[PDB]
Design a protein around this ligand. Structure first.
Ligand SMILES: C[N+](C)(C)CCCN1C(=O)[C@@H]2[C@H](C1=O)[C@H](c1ncc(-c3ccc(Cl)s3)o1)N1CCC[C@@H]21
Ligand code: NA
Ligand code: NA
Lengths: 54, 233
């Protein structure tokens, strides 16, 4: 499985291992249990437009 | 910004504005965290003294969300050269921390190898600022953004009267009249990946604005991701 096809299914960073991919996330996000999604840890995570007026 | 469109509410929340002795904007910046702004080293020579405004979309209206921050430390790249604008990067540490809120949020710093394989290989990035709306014009009172295609390095070098180093990249259009401009320099070039915006460039220089056969020149942030991390401690 490869980062060159759909970014390895990763929401953010993807890196290839011998057989597999490993996903990771920027500071302010936690990698989800599924190993793919990036879950914000606060209301103003990096790189997100501020569209939900709190 | 020449061409493009006005940023919509919440859509450019990492934009910072460097303001001179007058509260006039002269350069942009990118919010990286509560304490740090990314800008161009060449911006540091454009005003004797300056502060940083965040949360502003309209410089002639008080929305209520705007804040001004003083600079505690300037961290200029030690290889910056005025002659060529090589190494055109600086980080500012603010005296007081930014409170993130509507129109005030950081852009993400990507991992280098993934940025190279995944962001820099996208069709386009986005540049923003309050700069001039045409080469000989006036600065925009409203924050604008613009989608700019990545331009290949060979084409970049051929088009330029000045050296393009590997710390620079081109973006924009050959003949279409859309570009960054004076007053945008130091500001953000970001690349979208699945609805998240990552820092990819710093507005650095151009031969005029939106000229035929010329492109916008940007500091290549991938070359400086380790330097940024060190600078931010
Ligand atoms: C050969 N070089 C020394 C690198 C040329 C540098 C020219 N340079 C400046 O001196 C800066 C910057 C610029 O392009 C800036 C400027 N003019 C056009 C632009 C841009 C157009 C497209 C961009 Cl991306 S950045 O930036 N100038 C207006 C105020 C300061 C001065
Ligand atoms: Na305002
Ligand atoms: Na052009």
């Amino acid at each position: 499985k490869l980062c060159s096809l759909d970014n390895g299914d990763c929401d953010q960073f993807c890196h290839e291992e011998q057989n597999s991919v490993v996903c990771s996330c920027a500071r302010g996000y936690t990698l989800a249990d599924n190993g793919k999604a990036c879950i914000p840890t606060g209301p103003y995570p990096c790189g997100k437009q501020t569209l939900e007026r709190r | 910004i020449v061409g493009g469109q006005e940023c919509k509410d919440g859509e450019c929340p990492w934009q910072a504005l460097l303001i001179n002795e007058e509260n006039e904007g002269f350069c942009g910046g990118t919010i990286l965290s509560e304490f740090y702004i990314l800008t161009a080293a060449h911006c540091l020579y454009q005003a004797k003294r300056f502060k940083v405004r965040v949360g502003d979309r309209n410089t002639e209206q008080e929305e209520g969300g705007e804040a001004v921050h003083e600079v505690e430390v300037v961290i200029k790249h030690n290889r910056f050269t005025k002659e060529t604008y090589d190494f055109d990067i600086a980080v500012l540490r603010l005296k007081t921390p930014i409170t993130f809120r509507m129109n005030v949020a950081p852009a993400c710093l990507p991992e280098r190898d993934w940025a190279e394989s995944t962001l820099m290989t996208q069709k386009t990035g986005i540049v923003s600022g309050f700069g001039r709306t045409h080469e000989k014009g006036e600065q925009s009172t409203r924050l604008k953004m613009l989608e700019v295609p990545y331009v290949d390095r060979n084409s970049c070098k051929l088009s330029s009267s000045f050296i393009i180093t590997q710390n620079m990249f081109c973006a924009g259009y050959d003949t279409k009249q859309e570009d960054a401009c004076q007053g945008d320099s130091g500001g953000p070039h970001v690349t979208r990946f699945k609805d998240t915006y990552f820092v990819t460039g710093i507005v650095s220089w151009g031969e005029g604005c939106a000229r035929k056969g010329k492109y916008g020149i940007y500091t290549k942030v991938t070359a400086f991701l380790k330097w940024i991390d060190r600078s931010m401690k």
